Each structure stands twice: as structure tokens, then as C-alpha cells.
């Protein structure tokens, strides 16, 4: 029939890939998660305690795949939001870089993402090769 990445939905991909990462249990997270703010503007940590990092890794993996070169500061901007400075009007605030940095070196550690020229990250060959099993559930069910 023909196989391609983007020809599937985006909303079900991010969750399904994260469950793939969680089930495999190979992301190699040191464990200091569920402590830090995850964003200086976000005053509460993620609710999904057992997750929130398999999805974030899933989120960046799709993000780096669709882009060509990305950086730690760039992904902080992408995942950042608005900080409620109470009475002061809202302003855009970047996220903490450690969560984004250590989610990419984890992708490096397991083979999803390889370093790229001119600085930044890139979708790797191993990272793309495991998307076939990811899209298999989507294609089998609807057809």
C-alpha cells in the first residue's frame, strides 16, 4: 500500500510512541525527575508522575524528526509558556534546560538521535527504523 511517517495522525503518535518507550524501559533516566519545576513559568509539576518523560522524549523525537537542527534553548522555547506573575501581566518564559537537555542525550544514549553539523541534533537512522513498528498498530487497525 505504501508506508510513510507523516501520513498518520499526530495526536495518537505521540502517546503511542511514549507507551513504546515506557514499555521497553530503555530510556535510561537517572531518576531525579518529579522534583524540578519542568518550567519556571509552570508552578506545578506534571500530573502524570509515572510518565511525563516518555511523552516528552516522544514529543522531542517527533519534533527533531520534522525539523533539521534543534538546540537546547530552542526546545525550551517550544515547550515554554506564560508565567502568571500575579498582578503583573503575563510574559513568555522559557523552560528549564536540564529536562530538555537530558531528554536528548537520553535519545543519544539509546540511539534515537545523533549529533548534527552546524550544531544541534538530528533524527538518526536507528530513531527512524523503530517508527515502522510504531505505525504498524495504526495501519493494521484501520485497514
Amino acid at each position: 500500500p505504501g508506508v510513510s511517517v507523516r501520513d498518520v495522525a499526530a495526536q495518537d503518535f505521540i502517546n503511542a510512541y511514549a507507551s513504546f518507550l515506557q514499555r521497553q524501559g530503555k530510556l535510561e533516566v537517572p531518576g531525579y525527575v518529579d522534583i524540578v519545576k519542568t518550567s519556571s513559568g509552570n508552578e506545578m509539576p506534571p500530573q502524570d508522575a509515572e510518565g511525563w518523560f516518555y511523552k516528552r522524549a516522544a514529543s522531542v523525537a517527533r519534533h527533531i524528526y520534522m525539523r533539521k537542527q534543534v538546540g537546547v534553548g530552542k526546545l525550551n522555547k517550544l515547550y515554554g509558556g506564560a508565567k502568571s506573575r500575579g498582578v503583573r501581566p503575563y510574559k513568555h518564559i522559557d523552560a528549564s534546560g536540564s529536562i530538555n537537555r537530558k531528554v536528548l542525550q537520553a535519545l543519544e544514549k539509546i540511539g534515537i538521535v545523533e549529533i548534527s553539523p552546524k550544531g544541534g541534533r538530528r533524527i538518526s537512522e536507528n530513531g527512524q527504523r523503530d517508527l515502522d513498528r510504531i505505525a504498524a498498530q495504526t495501519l493494521e487497525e484501520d485497514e
Binding site: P1, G2, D7, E143
Partner: protein, 206 residues
């Protein structure tokens, strides 16, 4: 005619609707007529659109804002009360859910209920301010059909915003329950009570 398949995957439900005739997915945008000829050509029919988000040019002409689709006009007055100015992206979402909620009750055509609601709460006569000799009275005057639709949409949307405020009810379900009673006629819906109250006061202040 011979049907052929396509390598490119495009969903069948959209294709099936497009194949034979123009129509909504399951909603019957056709035969949504109103028995009252007074508001005819002042509620939108015979121009079925696929969604309540069309950026129709309504400021170029005196009345082109009145040839606007009646669902879009309903969507616009729901887009009010401060923090909801703009955000039409959700104002159509509520009407999508309200039409869903309207369908699950009152098994007849869901769209007809809205147009019957609008045609049922348009005040037929209200009273206007007259100065007199300082202060004498108020004078009752007839209401144009365009003014009717303006008030009929407003009262339905005012009632919903004031009903879902500070209560469990969502703006979608309560905007339905105002349209259910307005279309059927209950004298308890926010739009209907105000409609006859304005009519009643106009009768006294003829």
C-alpha cells in the same frame, strides 16, 4: 460511471456525502423551513455550509451582516462577555456540542429547533422612550423582523451565559436547554420570559 479506488487514503465518510448531493454528514440542512413567513428571508436557509466558521464580509454593506448564516450569527453572540471576545475557534465548538445535545433530545431535525427557538422569542412589539413634558410615559412601537432576530439571538445567548455561570452546567448544555424550551414554548426559558415580558410592558405602555 465506474467506481475506482485510490492509492492515497482519503476518508470515506466525507467522500460519500460529496458523491451524490450536497448535505451535512448526518444533519439535514435541507427543509428547515419556518411556518411563520414574517421572518422568512431573515433567517438563513438554502445556503447550507459545512461549519459555523465563515469569515463573511459583514461590514462592507448595510445589511450584509444580516444575510449572515443564522448558526454563525448564533455563534457570534455567544462570543461575548469579556474574556470570550474573539476565540471563535471555540464558539463553534460549543455550537457543535449544543447541536449534538439538541439532537439526542427532541428527535426531530436539530437545526429546526434553533430556528423555531429564534422565531419564537423574537419580541413582536416593545416600547420605546418618549421624553414628553419631562416624564410622561413610554410608547409601544412595532419591531422589525431584523430587530426580532437581533433580540431573539441575544436573549438565547444571554440566558446561556448567565445560566452556566457559577454552576455545574456547561455553556454547551445550558445553551441547549434554553433552545429546547424556546422552540417548544414553555414560558420558563430566559428568552421566552423576557420576550413576553417586553411584549406585556409594551401592551400596557401603548
Amino acid at each position: 460511471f465506474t467506481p475506482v479506488v485510490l492509492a492515497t487514503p482519503i476518508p470515506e465518510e466525507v467522500q460519500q456525502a460529496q458523491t451524490e448531493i450536497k448535505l451535512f454528514n448526518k444533519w439535514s440542512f435541507e427543509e428547515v423551513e419556518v411556518k411563520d413567513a414574517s421572518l422568512v428571508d431573515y433567517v438563513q436557509v438554502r445556503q447550507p455550509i459545512f461549519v459555523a466558521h465563515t469569515a463573511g464580509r459583514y461590514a462592507n454593506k448595510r445589511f450584509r451582516k444580516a444575510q449572515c448564516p443564522i448558526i454563525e450569527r448564533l455563534t457570534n453572540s455567544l462570543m461575548m462577555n469579556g474574556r470570550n471576545n474573539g476565540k471563535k475557534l471555540k464558539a463553534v465548538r460549543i455550537i457543535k456540542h449544543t447541536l449534538d445535545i439538541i439532537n439526542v433530545l427532541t428527535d426531530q431535525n436539530p437545526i429546526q429547533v434553533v430556528v423555531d427557538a429564534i422565531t419564537n422569542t423574537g419580541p413582536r412589539e416593545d416600547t420605546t422612550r418618549v421624553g414628553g413634558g419631562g416624564a410622561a410615559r413610554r410608547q409601544a412601537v412595532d419591531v422589525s423582523p431584523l430587530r426580532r432576530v437581533n433580540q431573539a439571538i441575544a436573549l438565547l445567548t444571554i440566558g446561556a451565559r448567565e445560566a452556566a455561570f457559577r454552576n455545574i452546567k456547561t455553556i454547551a448544555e445550558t445553551l441547549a436547554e434554553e433552545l429546547i424550551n424556546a422552540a417548544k414554548g414553555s414560558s420558563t426559558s430566559y428568552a421566552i420570559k423576557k420576550k413576553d415580558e417586553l411584549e406585556r410592558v409594551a401592551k400596557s405602555n401603548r
